[PDB]
Amino acid sequence: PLIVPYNLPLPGGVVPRMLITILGTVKPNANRIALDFQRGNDVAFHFNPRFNENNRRVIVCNTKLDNNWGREERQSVFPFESGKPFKIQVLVEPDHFKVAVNDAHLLQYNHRVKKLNEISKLGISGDIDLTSASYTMI
Ligand SMILES: OC[C@H]1O[C@H](Sc2ccccc2)[C@H](O)[C@@H](n2cc(-c3cc(F)c(F)c(F)c3)nn2)[C@H]1O
């Protein structure tokens, strides 16, 4: 098991064809989960499942620069279920991050932060039991 919030170093940042895999189990009655791919204090890619925003489940994605959130990208396809084991895979591609959950494509998020090799940490937080977090090149 891993303690949440968890920080996964990404040495030398990210690069296309790098695949980051997060395994865990969603807590019962979960409210929120977040992945934060960070460049220093900035958040290049925030991926944030919300289980109860106005009684809807939604995925919110955004970028934080100089402590300011930008424009949210929202996805109502919501593959997580409270109490169940999940896999999040984030594949860095040349123009976007591509996310698949439980082996089904979920969303893409275009790169706003372009210094990919400075996106050197992934933070994992929220209402999960975290089993592992790792990366590989495909
Ligand atoms: O635009 C993403 C951002 O929207 C709000 S702010 C905001 C309000 C209006 C317009 C734009 C932005 C959220 O408050 C913010 N947010 C979530 C979390 C968070 C922290 C945790 F510890 C955790 F476990 C988790 F799942 C999520 N921290 N910051 C962000 O999601």
From Swiss-Prot:
Modified residues (Phosphoserine): S76
GO biological processes: eosinophil chemotaxis; epithelial cell differentiation; innate immune response; macrophage chemotaxis; monocyte chemotaxis; mononuclear cell migration; mRNA processing; negative regulation of endocytosis
Binding residues annotated for a beta-D-galactoside, in chain numbering: W69, G70, R71, E72, E73, R74, Q75
Segments forming domain Galectin: 6-136
Keyword annotations: Acetylation, Cytoplasm, Differentiation, Disulfide bond, IgE-binding protein, Immunity, Innate immunity, Lectin, mRNA processing, mRNA splicing, Nucleus, Phosphoprotein, Repeat, Secreted, Spliceosome
GO molecular function: carbohydrate binding; chemoattractant activity; disaccharide binding; IgE binding; laminin binding; molecular condensate scaffold activity; protein phosphatase binding; protein phosphatase inhibitor activity
Keyword Nucleus included in the entry's annotation: yes
Compartmental location: Cytoplasm; Nucleus; Secreted
Tissues and organs where the protein is expressed, per its UniProt entry: A major expression is found in the colonic epithelium. It is also abundant in the activated macrophages. Expressed in fetal membranes.
GO CC, one annotated term: cytoplasm
Coiled coil: none
Motif extent (Nuclear export signal): 114-129
Function: Galactose-specific lectin which binds IgE. May mediate with the alpha-3, beta-1 integrin the stimulation by CSPG4 of endothelial cells migration. Together with DMBT1, required for terminal differentiation of columnar epithelial cells during early embryogenesis. In the nucleus: acts as a pre-mRNA splicing factor. Involved in acute inflammatory responses including neutrophil activation and adhesion, chemoattraction of monocytes macrophages, opsonization of apoptotic neutrophils, and activation of mast cells.
Subunit-level organization: Probably forms homo- or heterodimers. Interacts with DMBT1. Interacts with CD6 and ALCAM. Forms a complex with the ITGA3, ITGB1 and CSPG4. Interacts with LGALS3BP, LYPD3, ZFTRAF1 and UACA. Interacts with TRIM16; this interaction mediates autophagy of damage endomembranes. Interacts with cargo receptor TMED10; the interaction mediates the translocation from the cytoplasm into the ERGIC (endoplasmic reticulum-Golgi intermediate compartment) and thereby secretion.
UniProt name for this protein: Galectin-3
Annotated source species: Homo sapiens (Human)
Span of the entire protein shown here: 113 to 250 of 250
